[PDB]
Every structure is written in C-alpha cells, then in structure tokens.
Design a binder for this molecule. Structure first.
Ligand SMILES: C=C1CC[C@H]2C(C)(C)CCC[C@]2(C)[C@H]1CCN(C)CCOP(=O)(O)OP(=O)(O)O
Ligand SMILES: C=C1CC[C@H]2C(C)(C)CCC[C@]2(C)[C@H]1CCN(C)CCOP(=O)(O)OP(=O)(O)O
Ligand SMILES: [Mg+2]
Ligand SMILES: [Mg+2]
Ligand SMILES: [Mg+2]
Length: 745
C-alpha cells in the first residue's frame, strides 16, 4: 500500500540524512588515473607507484568496450578523457597490456567521432590535448594528426603561450585546467591557490599534478586520506559536505515532502550555517575558492529556513559589468548556477541591491537559454520554465511540487571536467516518496472537496445557485496544503465562498440602503434586521450567520475560550468598506491614492477569510497577539496591499467600462497630474513588488510571540492573487494537476 511504502522511504531517507558526512560521489577514472601516475622511490632507488591502490583500481575497472567511465552514461568527451588517462597510467608502470590495447582501440575509434559541432566539456580543449601529448610520448599509437585533433592541440599550444607570457603566470580562471598547463606553470606562484586541506580546487587530478611537480606534503595528505576514504580510488571533487546537505534539503523541499524531515533538515542546515561566510561557500568546508551555485543554494535555503543570511554574499560572483560568473577558478559559466542565482533572488527583502542585480542578470540568461539552447522536450526545459514563469511569489505549493516531480531526474549524471554521480542528490527514493506522498495527500484533499461539495448542497448555496465549480477554485487558492490543516482549509473555503457570493450581491443586486441594512445586521451580529432586505439577501445573511455559529463553536474547542469579540471585527470592517465604496460611487468621488487604499485594501477581503481559519490551525493565539498576526500587523497589511493593487491592475479596465471610476490607477493619476495610466501601472507594480519583498522580510523575522503556522497561512495567501491576477495554463489545468489526476507510481 502507498502509506506503507511511503513510511519506509521516510525511514530510508532519514538514514541518509543521519549518514551525511563528507559526501557521496562516484569514483572518477580520470582522477584516479592521475593519482596512479605518481611515483615514489624504493629503498634500492627504483621507481614504483606512490599509490599502488589507485593503479590497481584503473587496472580493474575498464568497461566492456575498452573505455573507462560511467557505464550507463556514455558521453564522448568523458570517455576520451577517462580512457586516455587510464592507458597512460598503465603504460607508465609497464602493466595492464591487454587493457592498454583495448583502451587504445576505443580512443582511436572515437577520436574519429570528435567534430567541430560536438559540444565539448569544460576545459576539454586544454586538458585533453595534454593527455594526447603524454600518450604520444609514451609511444601509444593513436590518430593524433586527424584535423580536429590537431586543432585541439594547436588551441592548447596557444593557451600555453598565453600563460608563459603572463607576468603572474597561470591566472585564477585557468585553475580548473591546471594539469593541462603543466609545462608552463610556476610551481611557486601556483601554491597560493591551494586549499587548507591541501587540494587544488578540490580536484584530485589537479592535486596529483601539483604533487608530481613539487613533492608538496599537503597535496600528498589530501590524496592519501581521500584514497583511504574511498578504498583505493578518488572522485572528481571532494569534499562536498556543504553542497550535498544544501541540495538534499532543497530537493526534498522542492519535491513537496519537506514536512517529513524537519529535524533532519535543521541538523543539515545548522552544519552548513557553521561554515557560512561573507565571501560565499564552495562545495565543501575546506574550499579556498567558493562557487556561485553552492552560495546561491545556501542563501536561498538558509533564508527559507529562518537563518540570518545576507544577499551581499552574491557580490562575490558579480563582475564590473553586472554579469555573474560561477567561480573565480574557471572560465565557463554553469547554467545550473544561474538557475540557482535566480531562485535565490526570489527571496529578496526590500532594497537588497545584490538580489536586484542577480535577477536582472539571471532572468534574461535563463529566458535566452530556453529560447536558444535547451530542448523543449526535456525535464530541464520544464524545470527552468517553471522557475521563470512561476517564481516564488506566484508558486502555489502543490503546483510547485507537482511540476518538480516531473522535472526531477533521479538518474542524472553531473558534468565538470568529467562525469560524476551524487546518489543523494539524484535519488530514486526521494522521487518515489514524492510521488507516493503527493498521491496520499491528494486523496485527503479530494475528501475535503467531497465534504465541501456536501456543504455546498446542505447549506443552501446550491439552492441559491452558487456555482459548484467555484468551490474548488476557492479551495485551491488556500495554498496551505498540509494534512494537519484540514479544518482550516475547509473553513477558509466556506468563508471564501460567502465572500464571492457577497461581492456579487453588493454589485449586481443590493441598493446602498440594503447594503447599509445588511452591514448593520453584521454589526449587531443577529437576525434583527433581516426584514429590511430582499428575500435573496436574507438567504445570504442566514447562510453566513449559520456558518459563523458553526465555525465559532469550533474556534472555542481549538482556542480554549470564546473569541467572538475578535472574530466580529474583520467582518464589520469588511462590510463597512463595502458601504464606503458605494457611497463614493454614487457621489462620483475619486479618492486620493492613500484614501483609496485605506478602504479598498480592506475591502479586497483578506480579513474575513483569515481570522477564523487561522484560529483553527492549532497554535495558540492569545488576545494580545491577534493584532500581531492578523490586522493591522505589517505582514498582514502588506499582503492586503498586494491583493488590492494586483487585482486593480488586472481588472480596472473592465470596471471602468461598468461605471466604476475609483481604482489604484485613477486615484494615483488624480494625485499626480501628468502621470499616464502606464505610469500609474508601473508605479503600482513597483509598490506591489516592494510589498511582496517586505512581506517576506516580515514573515522570516523571528518573534517570541507570533505563531509561525498562522503567519504561514496568511503569508501564503499572497500567492493566489499573483497567479490569477498577474499583469500556458489556467485554473482548470491547476485543479486537474493538483486534485484530479494521481501520479503514476
Ligand atoms: C481565474 C479565476 C480562478 C480563481 C478565482 C478566485 C481566486 C477563487 C476568485 C474568483 C475569481 C478567480 C480569480 C477566477 C477568475 C475567473 N475569471 C473568468 C473572472 C472573469 O470575470 P467573471 O465574471 O468573474 O468570471 P466568472 O467568475 O467565472 O463568473
Ligand atoms: C482578491 C481575491 C482573491 C482571493 C479570494 C478568495 C479568498 C480565495 C475567495 C474570496 C474572494 C477572494 C478574496 C478574492 C476577491 C476578488 N474579488 C472578487 C473581490 C474584490 O475585488 P473587486 O475589485 O472588488 O472585484 P473583482 O476585480 O471583479 O475581483
Ligand atoms: Mg575487461
Ligand atoms: Mg467590486
Ligand atoms: Mg477589481
């Protein structure tokens, strides 16, 4: 059964968290072969392998086709690098004759397939011809003079002269390709690039090359310890203790299953936070040179989990021209790093210039990549498309999870100088659990919708012709999906349906007098004025009043005491704003921007759909805390502001055509003669953008008295308006994906 399989996967993933160390990463043939080339001198003066275990690994790990590499993941550049270095290692030590022969055959066959249109792997044009030069000196028979191969050698020779002609020798941005630049390196000057663990850019191949030329003891210790840890081989990079923790957390949260791992996540993030630095971070705690990907992932993930981190860490990766780079130790810019840069920018607080710069660079870069470089029919296209089309402030949690389940690749191989696996980060258990859990939670939502449809009938809403499908749309907008908040979602959906009903009532039907009558009835919180309004409005009031009774009875159970006095206020405020709107409309009055917002930021309706539902979540809301989490707290007011203004930009045109003059647009223009509608819309969008960032700041802001679950419900109500009233797919598609179609498991 689903629940049983999910339960054991949760146990298995928790074990993974508990077992986190320096990182789970595959052996690297290219790196292990470089380590295998290293010599030591015996007592008698003869040369022998310094690391015989590494040589033996090479000896024993040739693939069936004669190459070395990752068997199920063939890539031409990877296989050529792995195989050529492996044949070099065996040849140097006069061993593995048969493997050398078959290796040379593979290389010769595949050099004939390397062409000018093949996408070459990072620094391949430097590190590969360096291997060919060595192979040729060892007398290995390969077609070195094929046109494109000669071209690679010539390009490398130009790079060599650039370094030798450089006053300061090898520049930082060539560090990634150190071992391909051996014959021109200044071995004294290069040592300034060494990490505290003795490695060079965490790369065992590069570290072996430095060791070969210098004898440096710290290089030896890094390699010796790494071989011991891996049982006689090495990976392409180590350690990866920061990247692995951050990405495991990020992936789990993104997949929609983070609620199962709260304690494990806190543990992983506490570890990373200890190693967090104003200069950014690299894959591992000992990196001298940090990288954009790990730093951006760090900024986003730590911030998302309430840690205090500064966006200024991003300035470490920005050049004079406002462009970002992945690492000072390389020349190529990695697409994944730019994706994570954009995702980190989603969590900007107000006036964080580094986030502004990050997004201004990353967004065009990603859109350019989607339009020019990425194949439409891939998980990567879908993933990045979602990143830019549904960014954080318009990302509904279940939609985000559902999309990522389809774009998460659980059989992925990473590319740096060569290919490698990180089994914690491309993980079939994580994906399987995400699918099972989504289905289980979905069944819960389906039952909630079943109860809501039953209520739709029994309450009388069906009788008064409330649209059945509107129920599901309000329900979807609740956003806070976790199983423990069923009662809150159900109450929110009932109240939202009445608010939809009320708004239509106030427009299409009610006169001002009838509106005032209805409102006085709300203020009295009784049925004493039902007689003053039309039968249809009476029915509306009665459905609402009955709901209030049922909901308030439930609030007494959860909160431990009567909270009617609190609960009455938002309903009074809401209806009073309705009368104010109508008074202005009949008087043809256009308020100032400030005066407009004072009324319309309330009338948009965040008050009623939040107070009663957040009181059913479970957290204690003390009398003095109501105003700190609900109206008029800053976060609440900011969400309200985003609601009203975003709605205005989307709908003010249609409203004007119906005789409604007051809007954010019209009122700003009245305050500001000379400002066009376009100017007002631009200003309003800036106000909304800032309000969303400010709400984010307020949300993550630590407090000793404000309940975070309640804050989360209010904060995540910002999403529905951003997604529906944004200045492709529609609501029916969202509901299908989230509530109707299960995921094939
Ligand atoms: C795209 C939408 C889904 C989510 C929904 C809520 C957020 C649940 C509140 C009602 C409006 C809406 C925004 C909704 C807009 C629907 N849009 C066609 C609204 C266009 O005008 P309308 O006369 O209101 O259409 P009707 O509502 O179907 O009669
Ligand atoms: C802004 C809203 C999003 C969230 C939504 C739920 C909470 C999901 C259900 C109740 C209605 C509403 C509050 C909803 C109200 C939107 N509106 C119908 C009400 C207010 O907007 P309006 O300018 O007076 O009319 P509109 O332009 O045609 O919409
Ligand atoms: Mg074999
Ligand atoms: Mg209206
Ligand atoms: Mg509107």
């Amino acid at each position: 059964t689903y629940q049983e399989r999910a339960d054991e996967l949760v146990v298995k993933i928790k074990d993974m968290f508990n077992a986190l160390g320096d990182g789970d990463i595959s052996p690297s043939a290219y790196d292990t072969a470089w380590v295998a080339r290293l010599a030591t001198i015996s007592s008698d003066g003869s040369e022998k392998p310094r690391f015989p275990q590494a040589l033996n690994w090479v000896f024993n790990n040739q693939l069936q086709d004669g190459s070395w590499g990752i068997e199920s993941h063939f890539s031409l550049c990877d296989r050529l690098l792995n195989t050529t270095n492996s044949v070099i290692a065996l040849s140097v030590w006069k061993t593995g004759h048969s493997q050398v022969q078959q290796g040379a055959e593979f290389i010769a066959e595949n050099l004939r397939l390397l062409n000018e249109e093949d996408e070459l792997s990072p620094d391949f044009q430097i590190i590969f011809p360096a291997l060919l030069q060595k192979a040729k000196a060892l007398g290995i028979n390969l077609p070195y003079d094929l046109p494109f191969i000669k071209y690679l050698s010539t390009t490398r020779e130009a790079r060599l002269t650039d370094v030798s002609a450089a006053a300061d020798n090898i520049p930082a941005n060539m560090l990634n390709a150190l071992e391909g630049l051996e014959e021109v390196i200044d071995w004294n000057k290069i040592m300034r690039f060494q990490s505290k663990d003795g490695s060079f850019l965490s790369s065992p191949a590069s570290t072996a090359c430095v060791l070969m030329n210098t004898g440096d003891e710290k290089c030896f210790t890094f390699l010796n310890n790494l071989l011991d840890k891996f049982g006689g081989c090495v990976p392409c990079m180590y350690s990866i203790d920061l990247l692995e923790r951050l990405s495991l957390v990020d992936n789990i949260e993104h997949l929609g299953i983070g609620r199962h791992f709260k304690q494990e996540i806190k543990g992983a993030l506490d570890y990373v936070y200890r190693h967090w630095s104003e200069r950014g971070i690299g894959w591992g705690r000992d990196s001298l040179v940090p990288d954009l990907n790990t730093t951006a992932l760090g900024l986003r993930t730590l911030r998302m989990h309430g840690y205090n981190v500064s966006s200024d860490v991003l300035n470490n990766f920005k050049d004079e021209n406002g462009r970002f780079f992945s690492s000072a130790g390389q020349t190529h810019v990695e697409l994944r790093s730019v994706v994570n840069l954009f995702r980190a920018s989603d969590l900007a607080f107000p006036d964080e210039r580094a986030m502004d710069d990050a997004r201004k660079f990353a967004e065009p870069y990603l859109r350019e990549a989607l339009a020019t470089k990425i194949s439409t029919n891939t998980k990567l296209f879908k993933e990045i498309e979602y990143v830019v089309e549904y960014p954080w402030h318009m990302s509904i949690p279940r939609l985000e999870a559902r999309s990522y389940i389809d774009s998460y690749d659980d059989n992925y191989v990473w590319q740096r100088k060569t290919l490698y696996r990180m089994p914690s980060l491309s993980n079939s258990k994580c994906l399987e659990l995400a699918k099972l859990d989504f289905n289980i939670v979905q069944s819960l939502h389906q039952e909630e919708l079943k109860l809501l449809t039953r209520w739709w009938k029994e309450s009388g809403m069906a009788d008064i012709n409330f649209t059945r499908h509107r129920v599901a749309e309000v329900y979807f907008s609740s956003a806070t999906f976790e199983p423990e908040y069923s009662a809150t979602r159900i109450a929110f959906t009932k109240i939202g349906c009445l608010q939809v009903l009320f708004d239509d009532m106030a427009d299409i039907f009610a006169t001002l007098d009838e509106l005032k009558s209805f409102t006085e009835g709300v203020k009295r919180w009784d049925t004493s004025l039902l007689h003053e309004i039309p039968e249809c409005m009476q029915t509306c009031f009665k459905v609402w009043f009955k709901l209030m009774e049922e909901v308030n009875n439930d609030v007494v159970k959860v909160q431990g005491r009567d909270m009617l006095a609190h609960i009455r206020k938002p309903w009074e405020l809401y209806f009073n704003c309705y009368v104010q709107e109508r008074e202005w409309l009949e008087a043809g009055y256009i308020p100032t921007f400030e005066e407009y917002l004072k009324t319309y930021a309330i009338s948009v309706g965040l008050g009623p759909c939040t107070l009663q539902p957040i009181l059913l979540m479970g957290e204690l809301v003390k009398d003095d805390v109501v105003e700190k989490v609900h109206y008029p707290s800053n976060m609440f007011e900011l969400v309200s502001l985003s609601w009203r203004l975003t709605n205005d930009t989307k709908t003010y045109q249609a409203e004007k055509a119906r005789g409604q003059q007051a809007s954010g647009i019209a009122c700003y223009m009245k305050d500001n003669p000379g400002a066009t509608e376009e100017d007002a819309i631009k200003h309003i969008c800036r106000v909304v953008d800032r309000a969303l960032k400010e709400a984010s700041f307020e949300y993550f802001k630590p407090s000793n008295d404000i309940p975070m679950g309640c804050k989360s419900f209010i904060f995540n109500l910002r999403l529905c308006v951003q997604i529906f009233y944004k200045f492709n797919e529609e609501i029916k598609d969202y509901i299908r994906k989230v509530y109707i179609d299960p995921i094939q498991v």
